[PDB]
Structures are given as structure tokens and as C-alpha cells.
Symmetry: C2
């Protein structure tokens, strides 16, 4: 394993952050292999570079238009000379905002392989990172009756008016 | 690749579910290699079978005592003859309850390698799976002022009395 190997894997996170930020689905998908599994936070499964690009272009044009990503490496480890794991911290600023929304905090795991064509992402699980405090809040919420939950969601709706 | 290979990887999810359910940290850690990365939902990093076992025994004795896991395979794919990805659905019933708490819904990704010693889990990212509806609720919450958030958390606390 080289310094070159490690630099290539790390660069994937920057390639993606920057492509998201300029709204490029193809840029975002570029590090991925043609067979890669991409799993989104709500359990959507995208299969391969092309699907990953198509899904993200559409998203950048609609449901995350105007959002901004920021992020950095949490760890990179080589399992062997042809396989690495990389965990990355990602945060999201929603449009019109200046700060990141905790609701979007993510800690994706990248599974990177060095094949015939060199390093590519073969798997990525992108999930939400919850704080313990947010976890207990959700536990509490789910423990409430549907009627009590509705009081809570109604209060949230009335406050966002408002 | 064999049927045997696939059966071995799948069995890991059952080994873990059953060990959790009988409160065995060593049982839960057994499928893992001595170098494996385990990342919990709030970003805790456990390194290797022994740490994974020590952490989980302590948890089974305290903060998740009396919880029950249920789960099933979502997909298994072989990248090559020595590397597989496996996504698993996990749900949790909190003690005293008969139903699973949505707050605990998880979709872990297992990274499995076939080394000198045969199949072992080398990486696992365990995160919370959010529905789109829960995501938008959290986005709404985080968009509120701290004072509005406090009204919401106070209401939740008053309802769980109650
Ligand atoms: Mg209920
Ligand atoms: Mg604010």
C-alpha cells in the first residue's frame, strides 16, 4: 500500500462534496464502480455508478436543490492492499440557512476496492447519525399514544408558522 | 463462490440476533475479525472482536437490558470470491413492550471478507433508518428556535407522565 492509494481514497470524499455543491450527479457518482451498492438514509438502494448519478442529479434538481454539504474524514483503514474502509462525517446546510441542520448529520461508511481499474467505491451506507439525546427523545415520542404524538406534531406545525 | 459461503454470511445475522437476545456479548462479537471496525448509531467506534464483545456485554447488562432484537436479510451480494456485502433489517422491542420502537429501526451494512480463517465480519456500520416523514419532522424541529424546541420537548415530557 502506498501514500498514493490513501490519497486516492480520501479524494473520493472531496469529489463528492464538491459535485453535490455544484449540483452534479455525474460528478457525485464518479468514484463508484459499475456494480456498487449505494444505500440512502431511508433505505433506497441504488445499483451502480449510472443509477447513483441519475438519482442524485434528479435530487439536486429538486428535493435537495440549494443545500450545501460539508464534511471530512473520520477514519481510513486498509484491510489489505486492495480493500479499504473509510468513514466520513457529513453535515448539511439547508437552503436559506447559514448553519447545518442536525437532522441531516451523517456518518457514511465507504467500502473501497482496488480492482483491475484501480480504486473504486463498491459500497456506501449513508445514514443519519443520532445523538443519544435525540435517540431518547425519539424513544419517548414512539412511546406516546398516537393521540399524544398528534399533539406533539401539531405543536411543531403551529410553531413553524409562527 | 458456494452456497456454503452464502449460508455462512447469512448465519452471522442470526448468531448476533440470538446472542443479543440471550445477553451474550461474546456471542454477538463472534462473527467479527480481530481487526474489525464496528460503528454504532451515535458514532462509537469499536475495534476488534474483543472490544465489540466487551462493549456489548456491558450494554446488555445495562442500557439495553431486556430489549429484544428481530431482523432479517435485506440483501447479500458477492463483490468477489472473498468479499461480500450484506444489508440487514433490524428492529428493537424495548423492555415491557410488545411492539418494536421505530426510534430503533436499523439497517446495518456488514462488510465480510474470506481470509485465511474463512468468513469474518471486517466492518459494520449500524445506523438508524429514518422514514421520510420522520426526517421532515426532524428538519422542522431543527428549524425552530431553541425556545420553541423547548416547548416541544416540555410537551413530550408532560405527555409521558401522563
Ligand atoms: Mg403505541
Ligand atoms: Mg436555530
Amino acid at each position: 500500500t502506498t501514500t498514493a492509494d490513501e490519497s486516492a481514497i480520501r479524494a473520493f470524499h472531496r469529489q463528492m462534496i464538491d459535485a453535490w455543491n455544484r449540483g452534479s450527479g455525474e460528478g457525485f457518482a464518479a468514484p463508484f464502480s459499475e456494480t456498487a451498492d449505494f444505500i440512502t438514509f431511508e433505505g433506497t438502494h441504488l445499483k451502480g455508478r449510472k443509477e447513483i448519478a441519475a438519482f442524485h442529479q434528479q435530487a439536486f434538481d429538486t428535493v435537495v436543490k440549494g443545500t450545501r454539504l460539508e464534511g471530512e474524514v473520520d477514519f481510513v483503514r486498509f484491510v489489505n492492499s486492495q480493500l479499504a474502509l473509510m468513514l466520513v462525517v457529513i453535515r448539511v446546510i439547508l437552503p436559506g440557512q447559514t448553519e447545518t441542520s442536525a437532522s441531516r448529520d451523517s456518518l457514511p461508511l465507504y467500502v473501497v476496492t482496488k480492482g483491475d481499474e484501480g480504486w473504486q467505491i463498491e459500497g456506501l451506507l449513508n445514514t443519519r447519525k443520532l445523538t443519544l439525546e435525540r435517540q431518547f427523545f425519539l424513544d419517548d415520542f414512539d412511546s406516546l399514544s398516537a393521540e399524544a404524538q398528534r399533539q406533539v406534531t401539531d405543536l411543531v406545525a403551529s410553531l413553524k408558522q409562527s
